[PDB]
């Protein structure tokens, strides 16, 4: 069989965080939208980004699967995405056998 890969990405918009007393450019507070019900609703969520014009993070998780052909892997990854509440624009690169699904790219 062949190894296929999936990158599931969500986009986050960052601004200055608030740490103890006040704002900081050191640390970034980053909000994004997580699907709470497939096809119906999402809700706001956040994360912190610390690194020792807009500011955007893309949080990606990747996984692989063995399959005979791209069509089989597409079915598998589609179902995996739905099950895990991942929805967005899909692409496929045949050269690298890699699918991507990205959520909220309109931000970038």
């Amino acid at each position, epitope marked *: 069989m062949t190894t296929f890969k999936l990158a599931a990405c969500v986009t986050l918009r960052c601004t200055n965080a608030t740490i103890n007393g006040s704002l900081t450019e050191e640390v970034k507070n980053c909000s994004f939208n997580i699907t709470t019900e497939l096809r119906d609703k999402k*809700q706001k969520a*956040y994360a912190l980004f610390y690194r020792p014009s807009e500011y955007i993070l893309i949080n990606c998780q990747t996984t692989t699967t063995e399959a005979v052909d791209a069509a089989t892997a597409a079915k598998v990854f589609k179902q995996y995405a739905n099950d895990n509440g991942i929805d967005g624009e899909w692409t496929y690169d045949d050269a690298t056998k890699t699918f991507t699904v990205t959520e909220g790219l309109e931000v970038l």
Partner: antibody
Amino acid sequence: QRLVESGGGVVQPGSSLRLSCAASGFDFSRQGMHWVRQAPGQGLEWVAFIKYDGSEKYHADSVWGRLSISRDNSKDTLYLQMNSLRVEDTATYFCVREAGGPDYRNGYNYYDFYDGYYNYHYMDVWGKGTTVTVSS
Amino acid sequence: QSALTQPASVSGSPGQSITISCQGTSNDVGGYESVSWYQQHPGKAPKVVIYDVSKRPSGVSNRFSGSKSGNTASLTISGLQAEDEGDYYCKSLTSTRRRVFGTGTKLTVLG
């Protein structure tokens, strides 16, 4: 949707008072709330707004430091704490609901943190109000 | 934020079309599509007749309409009827997330 204010009366200038509003008939924990006041024979004056989860508050400059808004979502109750009252704080005080809901994009309804409503920027429910008279 | 400016009084005969203005600054009225209007009758709470500058909540007849040009918003009532008599207040979101009311207008249907 119904809002019932209470806690009003006559109070000494410089003393404190806590107004209450009991909400019913709607999901209190998802909606923002305001206090608005009206002095007899005068116009409406916005007092304060508080987000559905209580995580943010805004107050008019004329009341800042004296009047402060809070809420208890487990009681479905909105509060206005009034400190160091002035004769000029005499008025009817209304508890008011901010109309809100999801934001629609790309086939999805988007909600704020914890599934709270985004604000639609108008007031769709008022209580009858409670009267505060400040006099020594 | 200073209170939004409204005329103290407007009037018309039954059937007339009248307009009530509300003037803000670019940080409230001119900065957002969030202007709303409230009708208040004696001894009662106000009720919203228009929001998001042009929109009617359900139950409000199409005799009520609203529009915005620059820093001034306007409420228009056509086919004026006796029951329209009362006080009207505009309100606006501001840039600081506060809200602000106009100074109010008494509408008189001429009797």
